[model samples]
Target: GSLLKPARFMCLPCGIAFSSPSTLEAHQAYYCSHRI
Candidate 1:
């Protein structure tokens, strides 16, 4: 049996797991909507 490793990189602002570089960028473009 084998286990999957946890995601290395996470969106600091959004707290999402990005599987790849593109998804990470995509999240940054749309998912991070919080304002302070």
Candidate 2:
């Protein structure tokens, strides 16, 4: 991926920027309860 760069995937609920979509997805799916 093209979105491998830092801050590409932004978690608006927690105001956190993830480096990769997979990491962000994991956070949303398992870690971030704020994920909607």
Candidate 3:
């Protein structure tokens, strides 16, 4: 048996943890104070 750990992609400007890189990028564009 193995411990399966989920992956998280964090935003560079803001401290937001996203499920994937794509969602992170999207947040950067629309929201995220640093990017917007």
**Every candidate's CA RMSD:** 7.6, 4.9, 7.1
lDDT (C-alpha, whole model) for all candidates: 0.63, 0.77, 0.66
> Taking the tens digit of each residue's C-alpha lDDT, what string does model 3 give over 1-36?
135652457865566678876786687677776542
Model 2, stretches more than 4 Å misplaced?
Answer: 1-8, 34-36
Candidate of highest lDDT: 2
The lowest-lDDT stretch of 10 consecutive residues in candidate 1 is 1-10
Positional deviation of residue 19's Cα in model 3 after best superposition, in angstroms: 0.8
Query: What's the TM-score of every candidate structure?
Result: 0.48, 0.56, 0.45
Q: Tell me the TM-score of model 1.
A: 0.48
Model 1 Cα lDDT, one tens digit per residue, 1-36: 145743455776556766786776566676778433
Ranking by lDDT: 2, 3, 1
Model 2 TM: 0.56
Q: Candidate 1's error at 14, in angstroms?
A: 2.5
Clash list (residue pairs), candidate 2: none
Taking the candidates one at a time, how many backbone clashes does each contain?
0, 0, 0
- The total of clashing pairs for model 3 equals 0
